[PDB]
Amino acid sequence: WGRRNSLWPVTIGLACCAIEMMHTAASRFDLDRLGVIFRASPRQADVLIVAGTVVNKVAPMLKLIWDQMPDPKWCISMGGCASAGGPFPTYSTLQGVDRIIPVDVYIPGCPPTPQGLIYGILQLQRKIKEQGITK
Amino acid sequence: KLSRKDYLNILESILFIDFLKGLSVTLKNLLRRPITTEYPKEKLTPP
Amino acid sequence: HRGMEKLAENLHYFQFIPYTDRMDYISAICNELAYVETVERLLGVEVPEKARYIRTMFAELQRINSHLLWLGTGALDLGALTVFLYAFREREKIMDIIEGNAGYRLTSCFLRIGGVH
Ligand code: SF4
Numbered sequence: 001w002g003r004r005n006s007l008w009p010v011t012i013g014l015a016c017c018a019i020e021m022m023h024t025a026a027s028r029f030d031l032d033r034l035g036v037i038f039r040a041s042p043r044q045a046d047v048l049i050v051a052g053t054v055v056n057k058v059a060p061m062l063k064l065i066w067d068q069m070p071d072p073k074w075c076i077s078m079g080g081c082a083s084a085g086g087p088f089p090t091y092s093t094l095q096g097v098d099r100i101i102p103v104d105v106y107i108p109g110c111p112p113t114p115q116g117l118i119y120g121i122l123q124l125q126r127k128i129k130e131q132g133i134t135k
Numbered sequence: 136k137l138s139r140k141d142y143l144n145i146l147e148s149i150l151f152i153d154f155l156k157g158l159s160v161t162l163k164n165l166l167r168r169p170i171t172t173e174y175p176k177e178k179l180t181p182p
Numbered sequence: 183h184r185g186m187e188k189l190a191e192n193l194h195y196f197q198f199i200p201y202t203d204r205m206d207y208i209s210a211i212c213n214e215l216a217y218v219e220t221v222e223r224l225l226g227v228e229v230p231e232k233a234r235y236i237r238t239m240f241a242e243l244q245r246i247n248s249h250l251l252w253l254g255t256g257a258l259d260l261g262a263l264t265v266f267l268y269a270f271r272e273r274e275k276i277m278d279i280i281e282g283n284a285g286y287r288l289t290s291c292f293l294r295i296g297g298v299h
Pocket residue numbers: 015016017018051052053078079080081082086087109110111112204289
């Protein structure tokens with residue numbers, strides 16, 4: 001329920017979904033009680049949180065940040081833009097980050113509320129808690 | 136001849152450290168209930 | 183760049199309001215006011231008094247909310263994270279008012295062509 005197993009994610013703020021990310025980190029919601037350290041350097045991070053829409057111009061740059069992370073890693077696509085392309089079916093928008101980087105949790109919303117982002121993280125933890133529990 | 140004395144000066148503490156101690160009246164008083172609405176335990180209901 | 187100007191060419195005027203929120207996502211109601219005020223000129227739509235004051239008031243609450251973010255992120259740039267917490271403490275109050283009335287925290291989608299939702 002409450003695990004000392006810490007998670008070190010890198011928040012990739014690209015659009016509006018990033019503003020809601022800051023509100024979750026602030027004094028109103030306490031995302032620390034869940035063991036989220038939030039390191040800023042991608043070299044020492046294991047969870048890639050894509051918060052915002054990914055433009056085709058940013059796709060090669062984002063993929064590089066992913067391959068540059070240690071192998072025990074997960075990825076959370078916050079909002080529909082990073083999940084499936086969101087409300088932008090246009091010539092310059094990448095329809096979902098899972099097309100260039102596997103994602104483990106999709107958080108719907110435009111943008112999701114701070115609690116929705118928290119529930120989404122618990123879901124990632126739920127997965128990991130029983131990912132090392134089967135085999 | 137006779138000459139009285141004054142004790143005033145550039146002794147700005149009569150009104151400067153007074154304002155600096157204002158932080159002790161606000162920052163110290165800011166130790167109230169935590170604004171945090173813990174989630175998953177104790178959710179904020181949407182309007 | 184997601185093609186905003188090209189998305190408008192394929193949508194009706196009222197359908198573009200939610201896309202204006204996603205331009206300056208920090209002050210969505212302000213974006214809507216600019217757009218809606220423009221379309222209302224093209225279509226020649228008068229806005230009732232109650233809505234005019236609701237627009238003006240909510241547009242100003244967004245300006246405070248937007249300057250708080252610029253001040254909070256501006257403070258965050260030089261450490262002094264204590265200002266970031268206070269700035270966002272006040273932003274949470276403005277969002278509680280906007281969310282309760284518009285229905286969404288950031289992308290309000292409160293204005294409508296002809297008044298407010
Ligand atoms: S999911 Fe919605 S709020 Fe998030 S970046 Fe995309 S359009 Fe903006």
